[PDB]
Design an enzyme around this catalytic site. Structure first.
Site, mmCIF file in Angstrom:
data_model
loop_
_atom_site.group_PDB
_atom_site.id
_atom_site.type_symbol
_atom_site.label_atom_id
_atom_site.label_comp_id
_atom_site.label_asym_id
_atom_site.label_seq_id
_atom_site.Cartn_x
_atom_site.Cartn_y
_atom_site.Cartn_z
ATOM 1 N N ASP A 156 -8.179 1.877 -3.233
ATOM 2 C CA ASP A 156 -9.646 1.556 -2.273
ATOM 3 C C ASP A 156 -10.690 2.563 -2.544
ATOM 4 O OD1 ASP A 156 -7.799 3.749 -1.349
ATOM 5 O OD2 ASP A 156 -8.070 3.082 0.762
ATOM 6 N N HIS A 157 -10.238 3.728 -2.821
ATOM 7 C CA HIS A 157 -11.301 4.878 -3.105
ATOM 8 C C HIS A 157 -10.797 6.015 -3.732
ATOM 9 C CE1 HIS A 157 -11.544 6.304 1.292
ATOM 10 N NE2 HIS A 157 -10.358 5.958 0.976
ATOM 11 N N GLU A 184 0.759 -1.232 -0.034
ATOM 12 C CA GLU A 184 -0.027 0.082 -0.184
ATOM 13 C C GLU A 184 0.926 1.104 0.117
ATOM 14 O OE1 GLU A 184 -1.743 1.264 3.478
ATOM 15 O OE2 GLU A 184 -3.399 2.537 2.393
ATOM 16 N N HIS A 204 -12.205 11.822 0.342
ATOM 17 C CA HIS A 204 -12.665 10.827 -0.842
ATOM 18 C C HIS A 204 -13.912 10.776 -1.411
ATOM 19 C CE1 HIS A 204 -9.136 9.050 1.357
ATOM 20 N NE2 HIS A 204 -8.714 8.843 0.465
HETATM 21 MG MG LIG Z 1 -5.097 2.956 3.801
#
Ligand SMILES: [Mg+2]
Ligand SMILES: [Mg+2]
Lengths: 449, 449
Positions: free
Chosen positions: A369-370, A322, A412
């Protein structure tokens, strides 16, 4: 003997002012896409997540770092591409919640079940579900979990912890906020304690702070979590030198690298965007963060080291990497930080693809993830939120805007976003998919049951 | 020879609260994709453009009209997908301008040359370049140009007109703003005059207003452009019944449908978003526009009619179909308007795919010129721009935000966005491409030049 192709160069091929000069293609792609398609088993999977790295973020980072007609040799190089949805659920009603947080989204790809914002590794009924990392380990595969965030943060934690709130970093937060999960209450423990139990072969990130907490119960009661890891046979490393001295990582001697107290250092520095910042303040050139140096491994170096150690497993490995974002409060609305974070991930992607192309049996998947709320707007824009002018690689000004919230904790949006893949079973990211399909794609590619 | 498959159902397959229930896939896609690839000639191309329809706008419209785990039977059904870039150029420097308008973007896919914002069919040096429609006609293909906009607006105009400013609708504006292009000053004429010269087999849209202007020179000096079209053998139609009466369209009797004075009627009505509108004002349910009725053909209806008429040509046809937006001004920041426009396009895409699947030699491409700035945000968001709560098909609230501009003229952003395709040569949209690659894709697929 030649493997499936990685995209070599999809920069603009010529003079962008001339007919044909902005083309990224040099000819028909039907043969190239055929060559990109295999349903043979994946021996390994490398999943790379860019925190907030939706299409806008990829575009802005490219514009800044590579120029508009430039090309990310990692991020842009994956041949099979689609768009996926990542809506979460309302816990009470089970109806869609159109804007996920990092926890519900990481839960979705790691378990294949949708959940509510803030949940890790549990569904809306607070029931635990196994993760892809747990499943890989159970099948005899090596496992890696790499992040520039604190390791207790949602993205890495979702692979190894089942808790009803992502806030449950250590014993103290867990007793307060997730009493059903608290070790002293018969639960599986805090995120950190569950990470220690999960015992991935390689775990590398930030988050040393929580390891100073002591366990409230169990075999290591009264010992710090760091002492517990030591006692349970982890190799603990804290910098680039100690990381590089590691020659093996496995279940007898699992690697735990804690490279910062909280999050690891951001790559690039720049000012926070301001009201009418593109009008009222000079254009920004990002600067290198002094905290970033050879003593702290980069995302790409952690990725390479993980690949090195995990690829010793003859059955195969699962690795998640990540590129995390520090994007709230004083750190929200920071184009330099956000772009530098994407550049970091690009380097790690290049390491993943270089390995996968040689090895031939590795599925590499790159997504977010977004998506972050940043928008690329006209240079003269008068916007109601926060804006900033930036000097790009093209020698032109780009303006970025943050107009989704007057507070600096909502960063986000709900937009579907790019997922890209290379290697066996990569067809499964093309077209529209759901983030939960990613679970099943990984499970099936590795032959897990 | 079975048909290349279209995606029949990528809705969430089950109960979204349960493990696997939100999956959009039922199994491995490697075979489906291998079946999706052909580099045989495209006999026909149908290009569908959604004005502002980036990934955010697709997601918002899906959320509202179909539910988060729903499925657009047209838009979401194309199996081959990628992301493309559409930056324009600064006219003076030739450097990238990160946020294009509709004119520079349409010029890009129609000629394969990047240009400056506002330009139609010319490069940064104001030199004309041939369009895909002009080339298709020169090769003996039938040609169609369909839009819910005024036909003089940038998207349809780019296929048929070469002018230094998109403002050059008719003689009056051309003589003022593009004097080099003005007929009486030695140019090729206004957008409308050049449209009449181009003589596509089928042209359907709005923009009757400009046809009331009279020519300033040439064979038809002093006649209205409507009278000019009549004199030159066009079949003029003005409503659903007159359009229905049309039995053929070709170079002897080209069809020109002018269905509104300006833009054709918006599908759905709703209030403009407002400051703190999700907090201060009720959630919105969109309503049908009374002005939309059986006397005015819909986008899908105009698409079906064009396909019927153009498909008679044995050599093949090129057809462009635009779901236009309105958007500015009083009409900016209108969730119901922009979502309804996307639903309109989805219906037209279904017609194109239904034809293409049966015909077997038709390449269908669905994309946007550039993305709208709307964002999907958390329900309790306090945003600095304009916001609105909407009651979706899920029975949940979705909030949309417009936070990019304090004025109502800048409605789009610089983000790369989805391009999708079905049929021969569809491989060429997968991965990262540029909007100018789309010109070359269409050119090569039809075997032009
Ligand atoms: Mg994260
Ligand atoms: Mg348009």
């Amino acid at each position: 003997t030649p493997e499936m192709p990685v995209l070599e160069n999809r920069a603009a091929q010529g003079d962008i002012t001339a007919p044909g000069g902005a083309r990224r293609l040099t000819g028909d792609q039907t043969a190239a896409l055929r060559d990109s398609l295999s349903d043979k088993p994946a021996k390994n999977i490398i999943l790379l997540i860019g925190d907030g790295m939706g299409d806008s973020e990829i575009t802005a980072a490219r514009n800044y770092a590579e120029g508009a007609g430039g090309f990310f040799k990692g991020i842009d190089a994956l041949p099979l591409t689609g768009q996926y949805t990542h809506y979460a659920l309302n816990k009470k009603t089970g109806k869609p919640d159109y804007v996920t947080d990092s926890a519900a989204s990481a839960t979705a790809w790691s378990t294949g079940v949708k959940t509510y914002n803030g949940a890790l590794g549990v569904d809306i009924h607070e029931k635990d579900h196994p993760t892809i990392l747990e499943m890989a380990k159970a099948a005899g595969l090596a496992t890696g979990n790499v992040s520039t965030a604190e390791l207790q943060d949602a993205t890495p934690a979702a692979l190894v912890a089942h808790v009803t709130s992502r806030k449950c970093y250590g014993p103290s937060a867990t007793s307060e906020k997730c009493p059903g999960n608290a070790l002293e209450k018969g639960g599986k423990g805090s995120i950190t304690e569950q990470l220690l139990n999960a015992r991935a072969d390689v775990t590398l990130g930030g988050g040393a702070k929580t390891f100073a907490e002591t366990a409230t119960a169990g075999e290591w009661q009264g010992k710090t979590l760091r002492e517990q890891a030591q006692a349970r046979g982890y190799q603990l490393v804290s910098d680039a030198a100690s990381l590089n001295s590691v020659t093996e990582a496995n279940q007898q001697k699992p690697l735990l690298g804690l490279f910062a107290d909280g999050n690891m250092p951001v790559r690039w520095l720049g000012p926070k965007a301001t009201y009418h910042g593109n009008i009222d303040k000079p254009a920004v050139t990002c600067t290198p963060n002094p905290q970033r140096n050879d003593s702290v491994p980069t995302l790409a170096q952690m990725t390479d080291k993980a690949i090195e150690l995990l690829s010793k497993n003859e059955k195969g490995f699962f690795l998640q990497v990540e590129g995390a974002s520090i994007d709230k409060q004083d750190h929200a609305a920071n184009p330099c930080g956000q772009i530098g974070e994407t550049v970091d991930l690009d380097e790690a992607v290049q390491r993943a693809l270089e390995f996968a192309k040689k090895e031939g049996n590795t599925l590499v998947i790159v997504t977010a993830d977004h998506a972050h709320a940043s928008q690329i707007v006209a240079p003269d824009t008068k916007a109601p939120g926060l804006t900033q002018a930036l000097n790009t690689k093209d020698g032109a000004v780009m303006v970025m805007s943050y107009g989704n919230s007057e507070e600096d904790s909502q960063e986000h949006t709900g937009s579907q976003l790019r997922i890209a893949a290379y290697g066996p079973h990569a067809a499964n990211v093309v077209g529209l998919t759901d983030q939960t399909d990613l679970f099943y794609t990984m499970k099936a590619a590795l032959g897990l049951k």
